[PDB]
């Protein structure tokens, strides 16, 4: 963990990434006024209750988080994010800006790569929301590295998702609506499922849009969820 290799690398962090790669694929898409998050839920058995193993987590009221890798580690990171967001709001009154929040997670994750007594986190987290000056999407690696994104993907299906995400940035250089990106998120998740086809899956979408959700994090459900599923099923063939 606190061990540099002779060529300056951190093998433990690199191994933690392998745990991420191993996980379900999750994505985030930035639109002209909000953000969309989507995740693939592997249906191990018919015994799992549909819609009832929620993977996407809210932090404060305006931030959504999705992650791929060791799920428990993601929860540990979100708990911390929530403490860090409550603390910020307590002192400064305003809810935490997204870059501010990103760094809070960033420093916390990095800290877990400094000491021999701890392991790095076994997740990559895609997160963001709407603040005082626009929409923000982030992705945070086990090393504590994070940058802003137009689109982001992690997990097993990350390569095909990135390919689809790269295509969207090229066809829509002037924006892309929240209502559109929700559809597109359903599509990209479906395409990325190609790799994990041996088992069935369930799609979870959530969004935080200035005009569509009033800058608050909301789960996509009902008619909007079904319509996106349709689009994905119809465009897969």
């Amino acid at each position: 963990n606190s061990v540099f290799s002779p060529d300056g690398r951190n093998f433990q962090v690199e191994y933690a990434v392998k745990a991420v790669e191993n996980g379900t694929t999750s994505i985030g898409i930035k639109c002209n006024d909000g953000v969309v998050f989507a995740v693939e839920k592997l249906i191990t058995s018919k015994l799992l209750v549909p819609q009832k193993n929620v993977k996407i987590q809210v932090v404060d009221r305006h931030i959504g988080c999705v992650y791929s890798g060791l799920i428990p580690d993601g929860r540990h990171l979100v708990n911390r994010g929530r403490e860090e967001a409550a603390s910020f709001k307590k002192l400064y009154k305003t809810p935490i800006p997204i870059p501010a929040f990103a760094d809070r997670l960033g420093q916390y994750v990095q800290a877990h790569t400094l000491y021999n007594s701890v392991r790095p986190f076994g997740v990559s987290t895609i997160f963001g929301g709407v603040d005082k000056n626009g929409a923000h999407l982030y992705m945070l690696e086990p090393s504590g590295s994070y940058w802003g994104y137009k689109g982001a993907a992690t997990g097993k299906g990350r390569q095909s998702a990135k390919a689809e995400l790269e295509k969207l940035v090229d066809h829509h250089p002037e924006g892309l609506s929240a209502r559109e990106a929700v559809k597109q998120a359903a599509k990209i998740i479906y395409l990325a499922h190609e790799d994990n086809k041996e088992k069935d899956f369930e799609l979870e979408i959530s969004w935080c849009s200035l005009s569509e959700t009033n800058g608050l994090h909301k789960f996509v459900k009902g008619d909007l969820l079904q319509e996106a599923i349709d689009f994905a099923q119809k465009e897969i063939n």
Binding site: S2, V3, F4, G8, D103, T113, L114, N116, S143
Partner: protein
């Protein structure tokens, strides 16, 4: 795998391998940077590389605003870089609160070097794989460059450069300062000192830069600020005429 390569204890040769390895980490981003002093300014230039097209270019930076007056460019991985940024910021605020004046560039440098020295000596801390370049126009010392490494070493520079192709740029600058015989760049506007820096990076690395290939930080009397793509594009045009 012997202990003397895993923690910061001495090897029989008297070396600290974890420190040596931390110096290698500094280059893993493949970014070069350089700093020059003007007559009444200090300029840092660092390459900006945005390989992924999914990345938001605006959030990719290795230049930090530490205080109103001090700026810092980092050569190293971003997670360690941001760790050093945060602390320097915290240290800079605390100095002002306790001692009533703005933390000087060299003093913040010394302080951060002292923190680095500790990781050199205590077993449970790893060094940070970064090299910190601190710039400002000090109220007492004038334009200033001070640079700290994973060993806890720091010194002041007339000019300096850091990264994989560090040496090319160093020898370029060394050669210039032999001619001018002075230890700065004789120019009034920071605008022309930014130009000099960009020019001598181009020559030393043999590469042309667009507005998106660069990152500029400028420190003048009582402000340190970074240039936008457009402030840089204007600089690139200015050099193109004559050169």
């Amino acid at each position: 795998a012997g202990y003397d390569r895993h923690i910061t204890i001495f090897s029989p040769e008297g070396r600290l391998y974890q420190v040596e390895y931390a110096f290698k980490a500094t280059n893993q981003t493949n970014i070069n940077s350089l700093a020059v002093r003007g007559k009444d300014c200090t300029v840092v230039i660092s390459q900006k590389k945005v390989p992924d097209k999914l990345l938001d270019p605006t959030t990719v930076s290795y230049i930090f605003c530490i205080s109103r007056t001090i700026g810092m460019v980092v050569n190293g991985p971003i997670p360690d870089a941001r760790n050093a940024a945060l602390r320097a910021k915290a240290e800079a605020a605390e100095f002002r609160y306790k001692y009533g004046y703005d933390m000087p560039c060299d003093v913040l440098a010394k302080r951060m070097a002292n923190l680095s020295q500790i990781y050199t000596q205590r077993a449970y801390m790893r060094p940070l794989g970064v090299i910190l370049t601190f710039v400002s126009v000090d109220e007492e010392l004038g334009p200033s460059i001070y640079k700290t490494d994973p060993a806890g070493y720091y010194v002041g520079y007339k000019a300096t450069a850091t990264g994989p192709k560090q040496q090319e740029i160093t020898t370029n600058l060394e050669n210039h300062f032999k001619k001018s015989k002075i230890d700065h760049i004789n120019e009034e506007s920071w605008e022309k000192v930014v130009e000099f820096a960009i020019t001598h990076m181009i020559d030393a690395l043999g590469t042309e830069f667009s507005k998106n290939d660069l990152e500029v930080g400028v420190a003048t009397k009582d402000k340190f600020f970074t240039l936008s793509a457009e402030n840089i594009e204007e600089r690139l045009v200015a050099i193109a005429e004559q050169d």
